Amino acid sequence: MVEQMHEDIISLWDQSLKPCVKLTPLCVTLNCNNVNTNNT
Amino acid sequence: ELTQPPSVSVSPGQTARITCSGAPLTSRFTYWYRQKPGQAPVLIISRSSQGRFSASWSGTTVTLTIRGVQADDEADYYCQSSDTSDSYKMFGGGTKLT
């Protein structure tokens, strides 16, 4: 029964968010600094 | 211990400038305070970001400006900055303004 619960959740996790926004072209070049204050 | 400025004169109701150099600076901010001749020291800094006189959080000297006030302000000034392990605050050879 344990193995049944394992496969049901993951398959549902892949199904969920399938009809949602793909972030495939979002990943690009990234240039930064840290905060306005030096770590306080 | 600390690189405190010895003595700097006042501008005639104009720009005011002080330094105070050290290794922490970017670690535990600045904190000034003034020693009145023969009287108890009083508040200068108004630190809150994690009155009147302000400064820029720099890693070279930090500095401090007391506006265009010629008279009403003459005392011995200092600086208290905590080490990364809360060891000491370190102070120089005083700051006697004129």
Domains and CATH numbers, chain B: 1-98 (2.60.40.10)
φ/ψ (deg, to 5) at B5: -75, 130
Question: Nearest C-alpha of chain A: how many angstroms from B59?
Answer: 10
Beta strands in B51-96 (DSSP E): 76-77, 95-96
Residue A38 contacts B where some CB pair is shorter than 8 Å:
yes
Residue B88 contacts A where some CB pair is shorter than 8 Å:
no
Distance CA B20, CA B95 (A): 9
Mapping DSSP to helix (H, G, I), strand (E, B) and coil, where does residue B3 land? Answer: strand
Provide the token pair at A5: 């619960």
Residue B57 contacts A where some CB pair is shorter than 8 Å:
yes
Q: Which residue on chain A is closest to B57 by alpha carbon?
A: A37
Beta bridge partner(s), residue B65: B54
Residue corresponding to tokens 């001749």: B37
Approach to solving: X-ray
Distance CA B71, CA B64 (A): 17
Distance CA B4, CA B64 (A): 13
Resolution stated for this PDB structure, in Å: 4.8
Are B18 and B8 in contact, with CB atoms under 8 Å apart?
A: yes
SS (H, E, C) chain A: CHHHHHHHHHHHHHHCCCCCCCCCCCCCCCCCCCCCCCCC
* Amino acid at position B16, single letter: A
- Nearest in space to B92 (alpha carbons), one of B6, B28, B26, B11: B6
